[model samples]
Target: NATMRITNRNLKMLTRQFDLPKMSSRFRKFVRIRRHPNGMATIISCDYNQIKQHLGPNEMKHFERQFVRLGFAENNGVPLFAIGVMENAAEALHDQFEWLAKNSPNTQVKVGSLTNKQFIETMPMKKYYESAMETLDMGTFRFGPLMSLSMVGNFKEMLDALNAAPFLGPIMPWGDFSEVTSDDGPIFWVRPGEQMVPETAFNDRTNAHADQVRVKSTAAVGVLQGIRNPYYEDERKAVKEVIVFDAHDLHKVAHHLAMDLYEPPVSQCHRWVDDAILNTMRREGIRYAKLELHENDMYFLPRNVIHQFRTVSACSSVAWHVRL
Candidate 1:
């Protein structure tokens, strides 16, 4: 029942007391916070229109500043979830797939490796989708950076057409980064499920982990179709949920680093946060948030935020990594 208001005065006081990085005055607008049942303050949900209205004409600049502020703020580190941010999500997915079938059918992609038993394998994009549709055991796969742009010629155009510049533009600022297509091209994640992959088949979920050190922030937008578990009500619908951990949770934060050392290949270089760490975090009562995103929704994560995704059904997603 408790909600707190973050005023500019409070922000200034906090910044001074903790020596926190100063945020711009324009980005210091009032923000609402919802207290967790345990009395910990957490982020309040905001829709795309709400944020756009608040940020106004220079939304991208303000949005990027807001990201840095809330992301690094003490005891309040959480990724921003903007609901219904992308329009025509399903249409974009369909068009990308259709284009791939016609133009890049023979383009090879790496599949599997979600489970330790299965080795990563390469197969033609068309063959992978066909096999996944027929048997629903194709595992998780992704198109490499080199071939991603060539395969999907109009992804950036689609973003522009949808007026998602406020969110997309900040992620890949022009002069700050070299080679936008190579560094900022979308990383496609296609998993098999009922509508996309078989319902009964086992599809491995991604393990918890922070993104690579070079990546300062990441944005993911996608759509999920079908259901995997019958017991859960939300899982019955087509949605994707991302579980993000707070940076202030030292014990939970340590577990990610420890796991990285424990399992070098999967956790170290790959930055895959192991599930065992999550179990330990729960046992110790660390703070975290589970964000549910539907079709066309987008979530932005700041630096050093450990996160993992749960996909209950067939899903297709595109993620952008921002180095700046």
Candidate 2:
């Protein structure tokens, strides 16, 4: 039987908890410039002591510096167990995560190191997820209380418009959104057309980044965080997030970030809710404009682009940084 682990709610008040160093997001997801990836190695392999000795002075200031900077500082993190600098990072990692030949499909090792022209992820995160279609089941969906029939209707239109519109290009990929500091903030619908395409119903949205409302999160595989909000740091790049919720769950978390109501770009209406805004698009428009915005074929967005979402009707769609 699997032994049960007890919860430690009062651990910190009772005793000090272990601390791990945190690194900048860049360090967390090391980047590899297209051609420049060859000359420099942002991350490298070294024994524990060597890693500690070579870390930047500012890096060691944090208690968990070792945890993030080096994978094996205190027996945690994605370890650089095998340095295939000579051989191959992928082959080296395959030998490391220890997936038996039979269990190879379920292993969790990077087959290559993209940071160093390597293929990562030798093993799957969970299991192979037998069928990608299996996730389509409703039972697997974890509903959130913060859902808007209006938003859902809008989504439908977004898909429809893309299907018809010709000038519109491909949709962007689902990259992880990060906290940004700026005067203006991340928009919930990055494609929202505020200052851009005001004529069309869906164009650009302001710093309305909802709680990271992603397809994977909303389909109820798990609760998705707020994706649209205007709340951000003074500088503005690092956008703050509220709670993560699903399409329809009873126990909803109270809102945390403050929101504001500025007149929308298209309509003079200023309706912004301090909740989440879930969005997705293709070649067709299906979310708004009771307008016949159509498309040629389906395509995915690549880089961040400007666009707009016209919520034809009022249905409690949260605006960013609403008056607190």
Candidate 3:
């Protein structure tokens, strides 16, 4: 009976639905319905208010307990949850861009150049945005980083304005013990076209890969402002979607294959995920869970769950990596 009660509680969380208020109906226009590689279909939509109401103190306690044991938590059967809608998210983003341009004009920002070379140089944030906007409008480049939480002068104010406490407060304790590196800051990604390749290969020793060493649990909170397109390879089964899967599952399936495996920088493994490894995962049935992110929707991701995304419309989002 206790197990049944727990199961019922989780089921309640999973199946809960949110009403589309008349005023918020505009947000629904960006929602998408897509089928997974396994033929399972899902309708991905914004559940901001509903998820916010669900993630109260008790719910967070429940999530933390589960995360400690499993290395991740799930909402509605996915290892992710929508935190809430940020008030005037667009305006907040615009203001931050202006602030960075005026204050950090000389600070160097990394640009994923059209030639696929790392271009780190000093340029006003506004100027970078303008040039990037032109490139994006031309539909040439696919993905690039625009802003980072560490660069924001008014981070506290922005956090308060975004109502981030409920979701972010639960994990602040970890930061005290963990080294907060510049790489830990949430990055705003601008994607406006299709990407034929993975932005950061799964096995790359870069910051994009999961940190297996000092990170007790990882959290990536994001807010999107444009349309995301379906992602697939070739004309075959289109894998057109964002995916999240357990990291341990990857190790269990392909660690011994001599393929490049994910290792945090501290481990010095210097290995990363590659195509053959991903193919092995597909063969082993470690398929990815499809995730749909939309405008104004704030979402959360936990550690040990590997993920990748692509955006088709001019879009920007911030991802925070909470270490330890």
Candidate 4:
């Protein structure tokens, strides 16, 4: 009875599954506290002491281990993903860090100058998920035509490499280091005052994909505007050069990044994006796929498959796809 709320129907489901009504409340709690309650497996709770002990004291130290990037590995992914200690952190604190994680302007970072919020706050949780940002230094790298763009995946690699060799502290989230004074200044800055407004539906005829993406935090305009990456030396590199995005967000953010590259319907670009259509037509027939709202680790369609995405979520999701 010393809890905030648990509905009656939810209680009924619990009783039917594990004889929950017959179990002692304290013993039942043990299952929950260990996060492995067998009968009623869904009743997970946020008990830190119970959590740390069950994972063993050794695993407890791994929480944001307070170390440098030269130390962390992808191996930490599973441990961080598992373990319920983080889930049960006080919500108030979690929200606090979530704010910081979203908005901490750490630019020309140094070791001792880390944002040290003790205990379980969203900031620490964010930092724990992304540890190097708090403990690294700053620098810059460039993508050729994509000039000012600092890619996130590249920065992740640089951070991982720096852990093995301590040259510049990591550029936790990259910024323009020269723009600031103190070594502790934020390496990057977002445009604060830009003339922006949501145009009405009847505004103009700029094409369906021409609208802009408004950022979740700070409401910055564009697909790439919200991105900040770690600093690094320019060693001239380029990959497939394919720009990727989770469908819905892609259309929205195109205005900020500028929709200079557009693919016309297959009737126009058959020679360009139509590998499968050509092969299939030549071998047996000619056909383009009707675009659909699909979800899965599905097959890649040859270059010229007519595809259209239906919105599954309002803003966007982490979903992605490829055309062979």
Candidate 5:
């Protein structure tokens, strides 16, 4: 009875296959909480089992053990991403992120900061995704370009070596990250902001090849630039709120929100579908959580989890989608 909603009827065809009716209720949540006075975080494990020896600080092992026990590697559903500020990380790379922001031409960055209101004013399509924004529960956002630390001369030599190591699993075989041409490579970052609305609530590799499973280590070497809202307060967490859901829950989640789960039609702007689904999830009280990504954090995102980001500051970070 609780699951009954308009989405159920509108998306009946899509939901039928998974015995969607039975799965309507919210599923289990697994987040390891670590609270801080200035911010909060929910730690998600990376592919550390294979590469822990290569990690730094020696404190990462404790996190690695718990992350593995939480089923980060085993489940294809539930929440599949976690975030937290890596202690001392930002301190170490602050200048590097800043230096590269000005120097690297290939970096992917939004030059200045933007408040939520300014963002909507600048990009009208954003308001269309009001439901998504609210479901995402984020504040003003923006980011500097993404610069590879390994390319930074000395920041992450281990990261590059780890990539060449054999124990790491297969990398993303497809999706936007697909190695379409020899020159293509992995990308990562940090910040508060609007993203190009995706056409579908897709898993990373789903767009490239239907059968491909993207199970690899998601590494980010991040640095914090000041936030977009100059007056933003850290105590208030004037940053992004990440909400994640089970991969299979996509249809039900869509149905509950009265959104579609199929390929977009030509007439429909892809953003419309993206907006409606996120809108429904928020208004309808979709079961999800706000992941914590502390500045200077390194985390992994699972293949099948549905997730989103909101930025607090114009942070800079580098990441690689590694073969696990």
Candidate 6:
């Protein structure tokens, strides 16, 4: 019953300050300006060894050396921006993606994805339901978590064709996959605020990020993870501003802002974190960065990166997960 609001145990742990990577100074010292790469660039095809041999050190490193210089070492696991990684295979993706969105209206969502086995088949009793219209919105028609069929194996032939001279390693496309669509055409809801107005009540939330309250996690669609992960794979330019902290530094984030794993039906109070939390994070010196993604851009974000984005123009992008 204690997921919607901060638990006492968790609150007790978050009383101090937190810190993050200072990417601003480092980015100025390390990164450079460059345009998108032509042709395909993938984990398998663009490994350090293969690229060095093919383009030679001076040429290959010239393009993306900034990424290496900025401490995003391969040991930290492969970071995003595999430029032109899907140049050849990008066309195939657009078509299959269209098929899924086109068929969504006719597709019945799977119940297993929405709930556990216990509530799989039955409707509620009369007393439990109350009225006819009241239960209408609560109907089983609420869609289950819809995900894209994996396109990894389908790209085998494309990866095979890139089997040229200095082969680095096999390309591996890891991570979850999902598609997004906006009415009128194949568009992504990049501008969430424009599509649906954000909450106004939380705009005046008291400086009580540390305020404690608890509610059951068993609300609509129940028990989702407390984190939001956003990965971009799109053609248009979309800017996402983020504040990131070191993995070891979450103590500070927690100290400043109490994070409760809230489930839905999320109320207006849940729209944004408490003001005290945001203000506290600001005072604690959390590093900030703005990411502008072009086509074929991909990255794994730090757990504490508070991601903010906007889409004022036409766009179509798929994400790793579709947040409920």
The sequence of per-residue lDDT tens digits that candidate 5 reaches over residues 195-284 is 432332211111111011233223222223333221222343323334444443545554553433332212112232244555565555
Best-to-worst ranking by lDDT:
1, 3, 5, 6, 4, 2
Q: Name the runs in model 1 displaced over 4 angstroms.
A: 1-41, 49-95, 113-116, 119-121, 130-166, 173-185, 193-203, 214-238, 250-252, 261-265, 269-285
Residues 171-205 of candidate 2 have per-residue lDDT tens digits of 11121121211112111111111121123322112
Best by TM-score: 1
- Candidate 2: count the clashes: 111
9: Cα error in model 5, Å: 37
What residue runs in model 3 are displaced by over 4 Å at the alpha carbon? 1-46, 49-99, 102-106, 118-121, 134-149, 152-156, 163-183, 189-192, 195-208, 212-217, 227-240, 253-283
lDDT-superior candidate, 4 or 5? 5
The estimated TM-scores of all candidates read 0.58, 0.17, 0.53, 0.17, 0.42, 0.34
- Assess each prediction's global lDDT (C-alpha) against the native: 0.45, 0.20, 0.41, 0.22, 0.33, 0.25
User: Native-vs-model 5 lDDT?
Assistant: 0.33
Better of 1 and 4 by TM-score: 1
Q: Write the per-residue lDDT of candidate 4 for residues 1-324, one digit (tens) a residue.
A: 323234234435444643332332332332222211211211222333343445544443332131111111112121110111112122111122123335443422222111221222222323331443342222111110110112231244322332222111222222211111122211221111111123321110012221111211100011111112321112211111111122223233233333432433212222322334334432322222222111111111111112222221111011111100
TM-score of 6: 0.34
Model 2 whole-model lDDT (C-alpha atoms): 0.20
- TM-score, candidate 5, is 0.42
